[PDB]
JSON list of C-alpha atoms in Angstrom, two decimals:
[
{"chain": "C", "resi": 1, "resn": "UNK", "atom": "CA", "xyz": [77.23, 106.18, -43.44]},
{"chain": "C", "resi": 2, "resn": "UNK", "atom": "CA", "xyz": [74.76, 105.73, -40.58]},
{"chain": "C", "resi": 3, "resn": "UNK", "atom": "CA", "xyz": [75.05, 103.95, -37.24]},
{"chain": "C", "resi": 4, "resn": "UNK", "atom": "CA", "xyz": [73.15, 101.12, -35.58]},
{"chain": "C", "resi": 5, "resn": "UNK", "atom": "CA", "xyz": [73.91, 99.32, -32.31]},
{"chain": "C", "resi": 6, "resn": "UNK", "atom": "CA", "xyz": [73.12, 96.23, -30.21]},
{"chain": "C", "resi": 7, "resn": "UNK", "atom": "CA", "xyz": [69.76, 95.34, -28.64]},
{"chain": "C", "resi": 8, "resn": "UNK", "atom": "CA", "xyz": [69.55, 92.98, -25.66]},
{"chain": "C", "resi": 9, "resn": "UNK", "atom": "CA", "xyz": [67.12, 90.55, -24.09]},
{"chain": "C", "resi": 10, "resn": "UNK", "atom": "CA", "xyz": [67.56, 88.19, -21.17]},
{"chain": "C", "resi": 11, "resn": "UNK", "atom": "CA", "xyz": [65.48, 85.37, -22.62]},
{"chain": "C", "resi": 12, "resn": "UNK", "atom": "CA", "xyz": [64.57, 84.00, -26.01]},
{"chain": "C", "resi": 13, "resn": "UNK", "atom": "CA", "xyz": [60.88, 84.15, -24.99]},
{"chain": "C", "resi": 14, "resn": "UNK", "atom": "CA", "xyz": [61.06, 87.90, -24.46]},
{"chain": "C", "resi": 15, "resn": "UNK", "atom": "CA", "xyz": [63.18, 88.52, -27.56]},
{"chain": "C", "resi": 16, "resn": "UNK", "atom": "CA", "xyz": [60.73, 86.76, -29.87]},
{"chain": "C", "resi": 17, "resn": "UNK", "atom": "CA", "xyz": [57.88, 89.01, -28.78]},
{"chain": "C", "resi": 18, "resn": "UNK", "atom": "CA", "xyz": [59.79, 92.21, -29.57]},
{"chain": "C", "resi": 19, "resn": "UNK", "atom": "CA", "xyz": [62.41, 91.42, -32.20]},
{"chain": "C", "resi": 20, "resn": "UNK", "atom": "CA", "xyz": [60.16, 92.77, -34.98]},
{"chain": "C", "resi": 21, "resn": "UNK", "atom": "CA", "xyz": [60.97, 96.23, -33.68]},
{"chain": "C", "resi": 22, "resn": "UNK", "atom": "CA", "xyz": [64.73, 95.92, -34.28]},
{"chain": "C", "resi": 23, "resn": "UNK", "atom": "CA", "xyz": [65.92, 98.07, -37.21]},
{"chain": "C", "resi": 24, "resn": "UNK", "atom": "CA", "xyz": [67.98, 96.75, -40.08]},
{"chain": "C", "resi": 25, "resn": "UNK", "atom": "CA", "xyz": [71.67, 96.50, -39.32]},
{"chain": "C", "resi": 26, "resn": "UNK", "atom": "CA", "xyz": [71.31, 96.21, -35.55]},
{"chain": "C", "resi": 27, "resn": "UNK", "atom": "CA", "xyz": [72.73, 93.32, -33.57]},
{"chain": "C", "resi": 28, "resn": "UNK", "atom": "CA", "xyz": [70.53, 91.24, -31.23]},
{"chain": "C", "resi": 29, "resn": "UNK", "atom": "CA", "xyz": [71.85, 89.57, -28.08]},
{"chain": "C", "resi": 30, "resn": "UNK", "atom": "CA", "xyz": [69.99, 86.96, -26.08]},
{"chain": "C", "resi": 31, "resn": "UNK", "atom": "CA", "xyz": [71.61, 86.41, -22.69]},
{"chain": "C", "resi": 32, "resn": "UNK", "atom": "CA", "xyz": [70.33, 83.00, -21.58]},
{"chain": "C", "resi": 33, "resn": "UNK", "atom": "CA", "xyz": [72.53, 81.06, -24.04]},
{"chain": "C", "resi": 34, "resn": "UNK", "atom": "CA", "xyz": [74.76, 84.03, -25.01]},
{"chain": "C", "resi": 35, "resn": "UNK", "atom": "CA", "xyz": [73.58, 84.19, -28.65]},
{"chain": "C", "resi": 36, "resn": "UNK", "atom": "CA", "xyz": [74.13, 87.01, -31.13]},
{"chain": "C", "resi": 37, "resn": "UNK", "atom": "CA", "xyz": [72.32, 87.80, -34.37]},
{"chain": "C", "resi": 38, "resn": "UNK", "atom": "CA", "xyz": [72.22, 90.61, -36.91]},
{"chain": "C", "resi": 39, "resn": "UNK", "atom": "CA", "xyz": [69.02, 91.93, -38.47]},
{"chain": "C", "resi": 40, "resn": "UNK", "atom": "CA", "xyz": [68.92, 91.92, -42.27]},
{"chain": "C", "resi": 41, "resn": "UNK", "atom": "CA", "xyz": [66.46, 93.56, -44.64]},
{"chain": "C", "resi": 42, "resn": "UNK", "atom": "CA", "xyz": [64.23, 90.45, -44.61]},
{"chain": "C", "resi": 43, "resn": "UNK", "atom": "CA", "xyz": [65.56, 88.09, -41.98]},
{"chain": "C", "resi": 44, "resn": "UNK", "atom": "CA", "xyz": [68.29, 87.39, -39.49]},
{"chain": "C", "resi": 45, "resn": "UNK", "atom": "CA", "xyz": [71.82, 85.94, -39.47]},
{"chain": "C", "resi": 46, "resn": "UNK", "atom": "CA", "xyz": [73.32, 84.22, -36.44]},
{"chain": "C", "resi": 47, "resn": "UNK", "atom": "CA", "xyz": [76.87, 85.22, -35.51]},
{"chain": "C", "resi": 48, "resn": "UNK", "atom": "CA", "xyz": [79.21, 82.25, -35.14]},
{"chain": "C", "resi": 49, "resn": "UNK", "atom": "CA", "xyz": [80.71, 82.11, -31.64]},
{"chain": "C", "resi": 50, "resn": "UNK", "atom": "CA", "xyz": [83.23, 79.85, -29.94]},
{"chain": "C", "resi": 51, "resn": "UNK", "atom": "CA", "xyz": [82.31, 78.11, -26.70]},
{"chain": "C", "resi": 52, "resn": "UNK", "atom": "CA", "xyz": [81.86, 80.17, -23.55]},
{"chain": "C", "resi": 53, "resn": "UNK", "atom": "CA", "xyz": [84.98, 80.60, -21.41]},
{"chain": "C", "resi": 54, "resn": "UNK", "atom": "CA", "xyz": [85.66, 82.51, -18.17]},
{"chain": "C", "resi": 55, "resn": "UNK", "atom": "CA", "xyz": [88.70, 84.24, -19.73]},
{"chain": "C", "resi": 56, "resn": "UNK", "atom": "CA", "xyz": [89.41, 85.43, -23.29]},
{"chain": "I", "resi": 1, "resn": "UNK", "atom": "CA", "xyz": [87.58, 101.05, -22.15]},
{"chain": "I", "resi": 2, "resn": "UNK", "atom": "CA", "xyz": [86.08, 103.49, -24.62]},
{"chain": "I", "resi": 3, "resn": "UNK", "atom": "CA", "xyz": [83.09, 102.73, -26.77]},
{"chain": "I", "resi": 4, "resn": "UNK", "atom": "CA", "xyz": [82.75, 102.25, -30.51]},
{"chain": "I", "resi": 5, "resn": "UNK", "atom": "CA", "xyz": [79.62, 101.08, -32.29]},
{"chain": "I", "resi": 6, "resn": "UNK", "atom": "CA", "xyz": [78.31, 99.79, -35.60]},
{"chain": "I", "resi": 7, "resn": "UNK", "atom": "CA", "xyz": [78.41, 101.69, -38.91]},
{"chain": "I", "resi": 8, "resn": "UNK", "atom": "CA", "xyz": [76.22, 100.72, -41.83]},
{"chain": "I", "resi": 9, "resn": "UNK", "atom": "CA", "xyz": [76.02, 101.09, -45.60]},
{"chain": "I", "resi": 10, "resn": "UNK", "atom": "CA", "xyz": [73.43, 99.85, -48.07]},
{"chain": "I", "resi": 11, "resn": "UNK", "atom": "CA", "xyz": [75.79, 98.26, -50.60]},
{"chain": "I", "resi": 12, "resn": "UNK", "atom": "CA", "xyz": [79.34, 96.96, -50.87]},
{"chain": "I", "resi": 13, "resn": "UNK", "atom": "CA", "xyz": [80.13, 99.60, -53.48]},
{"chain": "I", "resi": 14, "resn": "UNK", "atom": "CA", "xyz": [79.00, 102.36, -51.15]},
{"chain": "I", "resi": 15, "resn": "UNK", "atom": "CA", "xyz": [80.94, 100.91, -48.22]},
{"chain": "I", "resi": 16, "resn": "UNK", "atom": "CA", "xyz": [84.22, 100.39, -50.08]},
{"chain": "I", "resi": 17, "resn": "UNK", "atom": "CA", "xyz": [84.49, 104.09, -50.95]},
{"chain": "I", "resi": 18, "resn": "UNK", "atom": "CA", "xyz": [84.13, 105.32, -47.36]},
{"chain": "I", "resi": 19, "resn": "UNK", "atom": "CA", "xyz": [85.17, 102.47, -45.06]},
{"chain": "I", "resi": 20, "resn": "UNK", "atom": "CA", "xyz": [88.79, 103.56, -44.61]},
{"chain": "I", "resi": 21, "resn": "UNK", "atom": "CA", "xyz": [87.47, 106.42, -42.46]},
{"chain": "I", "resi": 22, "resn": "UNK", "atom": "CA", "xyz": [85.98, 104.02, -39.88]},
{"chain": "I", "resi": 23, "resn": "UNK", "atom": "CA", "xyz": [88.06, 104.03, -36.67]},
{"chain": "I", "resi": 24, "resn": "UNK", "atom": "CA", "xyz": [89.61, 100.91, -35.22]},
{"chain": "I", "resi": 25, "resn": "UNK", "atom": "CA", "xyz": [87.27, 98.75, -33.17]},
{"chain": "I", "resi": 26, "resn": "UNK", "atom": "CA", "xyz": [84.02, 99.63, -34.94]},
{"chain": "I", "resi": 27, "resn": "UNK", "atom": "CA", "xyz": [81.81, 97.09, -36.60]},
{"chain": "I", "resi": 28, "resn": "UNK", "atom": "CA", "xyz": [80.76, 97.60, -40.24]},
{"chain": "I", "resi": 29, "resn": "UNK", "atom": "CA", "xyz": [77.43, 96.31, -41.60]},
{"chain": "I", "resi": 30, "resn": "UNK", "atom": "CA", "xyz": [76.78, 96.02, -45.34]},
{"chain": "I", "resi": 31, "resn": "UNK", "atom": "CA", "xyz": [73.07, 95.62, -46.00]},
{"chain": "I", "resi": 32, "resn": "UNK", "atom": "CA", "xyz": [73.23, 94.15, -49.51]},
{"chain": "I", "resi": 33, "resn": "UNK", "atom": "CA", "xyz": [74.66, 90.80, -48.40]},
{"chain": "I", "resi": 34, "resn": "UNK", "atom": "CA", "xyz": [73.80, 91.27, -44.70]},
{"chain": "I", "resi": 35, "resn": "UNK", "atom": "CA", "xyz": [77.49, 91.08, -43.78]},
{"chain": "I", "resi": 36, "resn": "UNK", "atom": "CA", "xyz": [79.57, 92.29, -40.86]},
{"chain": "I", "resi": 37, "resn": "UNK", "atom": "CA", "xyz": [83.22, 93.27, -40.55]},
{"chain": "I", "resi": 38, "resn": "UNK", "atom": "CA", "xyz": [85.43, 94.54, -37.71]},
{"chain": "I", "resi": 39, "resn": "UNK", "atom": "CA", "xyz": [87.86, 97.45, -38.31]},
{"chain": "I", "resi": 40, "resn": "UNK", "atom": "CA", "xyz": [91.43, 96.75, -37.19]},
{"chain": "I", "resi": 41, "resn": "UNK", "atom": "CA", "xyz": [94.28, 99.21, -36.74]},
{"chain": "I", "resi": 42, "resn": "UNK", "atom": "CA", "xyz": [95.69, 97.79, -40.01]},
{"chain": "I", "resi": 43, "resn": "UNK", "atom": "CA", "xyz": [92.87, 96.26, -42.03]},
{"chain": "I", "resi": 44, "resn": "UNK", "atom": "CA", "xyz": [89.57, 94.42, -41.59]},
{"chain": "I", "resi": 45, "resn": "UNK", "atom": "CA", "xyz": [88.26, 91.05, -40.38]},
{"chain": "I", "resi": 46, "resn": "UNK", "atom": "CA", "xyz": [85.05, 89.49, -41.66]},
{"chain": "I", "resi": 47, "resn": "UNK", "atom": "CA", "xyz": [82.62, 88.10, -39.06]},
{"chain": "I", "resi": 48, "resn": "UNK", "atom": "CA", "xyz": [81.41, 84.56, -39.74]},
{"chain": "I", "resi": 49, "resn": "UNK", "atom": "CA", "xyz": [77.61, 84.48, -40.02]},
{"chain": "I", "resi": 50, "resn": "UNK", "atom": "CA", "xyz": [75.21, 81.61, -40.57]},
{"chain": "I", "resi": 51, "resn": "UNK", "atom": "CA", "xyz": [72.82, 81.77, -43.51]},
{"chain": "I", "resi": 52, "resn": "UNK", "atom": "CA", "xyz": [69.89, 84.18, -43.37]},
{"chain": "I", "resi": 53, "resn": "UNK", "atom": "CA", "xyz": [66.62, 82.85, -41.91]},
{"chain": "I", "resi": 54, "resn": "UNK", "atom": "CA", "xyz": [63.20, 84.48, -41.44]},
{"chain": "I", "resi": 55, "resn": "UNK", "atom": "CA", "xyz": [63.47, 84.48, -37.63]},
{"chain": "I", "resi": 56, "resn": "UNK", "atom": "CA", "xyz": [66.40, 84.39, -35.15]},
{"chain": "I", "resi": 57, "resn": "UNK", "atom": "CA", "xyz": [66.09, 80.70, -34.27]},
{"chain": "P", "resi": 1, "resn": "UNK", "atom": "CA", "xyz": [64.65, 95.12, -24.68]},
{"chain": "P", "resi": 2, "resn": "UNK", "atom": "CA", "xyz": [67.52, 97.41, -23.78]},
{"chain": "P", "resi": 3, "resn": "UNK", "atom": "CA", "xyz": [70.66, 98.43, -25.66]},
{"chain": "P", "resi": 4, "resn": "UNK", "atom": "CA", "xyz": [74.34, 97.66, -25.23]},
{"chain": "P", "resi": 5, "resn": "UNK", "atom": "CA", "xyz": [77.27, 98.49, -27.51]},
{"chain": "P", "resi": 6, "resn": "UNK", "atom": "CA", "xyz": [80.94, 97.81, -28.25]},
{"chain": "P", "resi": 7, "resn": "UNK", "atom": "CA", "xyz": [83.87, 98.63, -26.00]},
{"chain": "P", "resi": 8, "resn": "UNK", "atom": "CA", "xyz": [87.56, 98.81, -26.86]},
{"chain": "P", "resi": 9, "resn": "UNK", "atom": "CA", "xyz": [90.81, 97.92, -25.12]},
{"chain": "P", "resi": 10, "resn": "UNK", "atom": "CA", "xyz": [94.37, 97.74, -26.40]},
{"chain": "P", "resi": 11, "resn": "UNK", "atom": "CA", "xyz": [95.22, 94.36, -24.84]},
{"chain": "P", "resi": 12, "resn": "UNK", "atom": "CA", "xyz": [93.64, 91.31, -23.25]},
{"chain": "P", "resi": 13, "resn": "UNK", "atom": "CA", "xyz": [95.26, 92.26, -19.92]},
{"chain": "P", "resi": 14, "resn": "UNK", "atom": "CA", "xyz": [93.98, 95.85, -20.04]},
{"chain": "P", "resi": 15, "resn": "UNK", "atom": "CA", "xyz": [90.49, 94.54, -20.81]},
{"chain": "P", "resi": 16, "resn": "UNK", "atom": "CA", "xyz": [90.61, 91.97, -18.00]},
{"chain": "P", "resi": 17, "resn": "UNK", "atom": "CA", "xyz": [91.38, 94.67, -15.46]},
{"chain": "P", "resi": 18, "resn": "UNK", "atom": "CA", "xyz": [88.08, 96.39, -16.31]},
{"chain": "P", "resi": 19, "resn": "UNK", "atom": "CA", "xyz": [85.82, 93.52, -17.38]},
{"chain": "P", "resi": 20, "resn": "UNK", "atom": "CA", "xyz": [83.78, 93.41, -14.17]},
{"chain": "P", "resi": 21, "resn": "UNK", "atom": "CA", "xyz": [82.41, 96.77, -15.34]},
{"chain": "P", "resi": 22, "resn": "UNK", "atom": "CA", "xyz": [81.14, 95.23, -18.60]},
{"chain": "P", "resi": 23, "resn": "UNK", "atom": "CA", "xyz": [77.59, 93.77, -18.48]},
{"chain": "P", "resi": 24, "resn": "UNK", "atom": "CA", "xyz": [76.46, 90.75, -20.43]},
{"chain": "P", "resi": 25, "resn": "UNK", "atom": "CA", "xyz": [75.60, 91.55, -24.03]},
{"chain": "P", "resi": 26, "resn": "UNK", "atom": "CA", "xyz": [78.32, 94.09, -24.70]},
{"chain": "P", "resi": 27, "resn": "UNK", "atom": "CA", "xyz": [80.81, 93.39, -27.42]},
{"chain": "P", "resi": 28, "resn": "UNK", "atom": "CA", "xyz": [84.50, 93.68, -26.54]},
{"chain": "P", "resi": 29, "resn": "UNK", "atom": "CA", "xyz": [87.20, 94.57, -29.06]},
{"chain": "P", "resi": 30, "resn": "UNK", "atom": "CA", "xyz": [90.86, 93.92, -28.19]},
{"chain": "P", "resi": 31, "resn": "UNK", "atom": "CA", "xyz": [93.17, 95.79, -30.52]},
{"chain": "P", "resi": 32, "resn": "UNK", "atom": "CA", "xyz": [96.09, 93.39, -30.06]},
{"chain": "P", "resi": 33, "resn": "UNK", "atom": "CA", "xyz": [95.17, 90.60, -32.50]},
{"chain": "P", "resi": 34, "resn": "UNK", "atom": "CA", "xyz": [92.03, 92.53, -33.64]},
{"chain": "P", "resi": 35, "resn": "UNK", "atom": "CA", "xyz": [89.76, 90.21, -31.71]},
{"chain": "P", "resi": 36, "resn": "UNK", "atom": "CA", "xyz": [86.11, 90.46, -30.82]},
{"chain": "P", "resi": 37, "resn": "UNK", "atom": "CA", "xyz": [84.28, 88.87, -27.90]},
{"chain": "P", "resi": 38, "resn": "UNK", "atom": "CA", "xyz": [80.80, 89.03, -26.47]},
{"chain": "P", "resi": 39, "resn": "UNK", "atom": "CA", "xyz": [80.32, 89.30, -22.73]},
{"chain": "P", "resi": 40, "resn": "UNK", "atom": "CA", "xyz": [78.24, 86.61, -21.09]},
{"chain": "P", "resi": 41, "resn": "UNK", "atom": "CA", "xyz": [77.21, 86.32, -17.46]},
{"chain": "P", "resi": 42, "resn": "UNK", "atom": "CA", "xyz": [80.49, 85.16, -15.86]},
{"chain": "P", "resi": 43, "resn": "UNK", "atom": "CA", "xyz": [82.50, 84.89, -19.08]},
{"chain": "P", "resi": 44, "resn": "UNK", "atom": "CA", "xyz": [83.07, 85.51, -22.79]},
{"chain": "P", "resi": 45, "resn": "UNK", "atom": "CA", "xyz": [82.39, 83.97, -26.17]},
{"chain": "P", "resi": 46, "resn": "UNK", "atom": "CA", "xyz": [84.89, 84.73, -28.91]},
{"chain": "P", "resi": 47, "resn": "UNK", "atom": "CA", "xyz": [83.39, 85.83, -32.23]},
{"chain": "P", "resi": 48, "resn": "UNK", "atom": "CA", "xyz": [84.66, 83.74, -35.12]},
{"chain": "P", "resi": 49, "resn": "UNK", "atom": "CA", "xyz": [86.53, 86.14, -37.40]},
{"chain": "P", "resi": 50, "resn": "UNK", "atom": "CA", "xyz": [88.27, 85.54, -40.72]},
{"chain": "P", "resi": 51, "resn": "UNK", "atom": "CA", "xyz": [91.84, 86.62, -41.22]},
{"chain": "P", "resi": 52, "resn": "UNK", "atom": "CA", "xyz": [92.90, 90.27, -41.21]},
{"chain": "P", "resi": 53, "resn": "UNK", "atom": "CA", "xyz": [93.17, 91.71, -44.71]},
{"chain": "P", "resi": 54, "resn": "UNK", "atom": "CA", "xyz": [93.94, 95.21, -46.01]},
{"chain": "P", "resi": 55, "resn": "UNK", "atom": "CA", "xyz": [90.49, 95.54, -47.65]},
{"chain": "P", "resi": 56, "resn": "UNK", "atom": "CA", "xyz": [87.12, 94.17, -46.55]},
{"chain": "P", "resi": 57, "resn": "UNK", "atom": "CA", "xyz": [87.07, 90.83, -48.34]}
]
């Protein structure tokens, strides 16, 4: 059982130019609207998140 | 404040035979269905994911 | 295109005492309630998780 991780970008614009480099099974975070995805074998799945709050 | 990470397996079958060894607080990726779980102290929680798309829109 | 990770705390209160040290884009696991959050700039988004089960369902 291998390991992956989480890759980060500040903006969607920057992410879209580089996301092809992300290996399968890694997570992808885009800071501007606090979005999270996971990379699949042949696509992407968006993680479902509740609304942003200052506290948990 | 310690760190965990993400563990991955290619198939559900492969995962189910080894996943008990994953420590609490790690994420678990199963490539076959492109699914994610979180390891709890006593069990697992499945992450809700939207359907697969070609790009992260 | 940097990298982040996952960090672990036992409780919401323990986490909150350290959260200023957590940058945006890190995932946060809280063992009490087996909950997962993502750090945003100035806050958190809770990951939607299904119910805890003994096996990955």
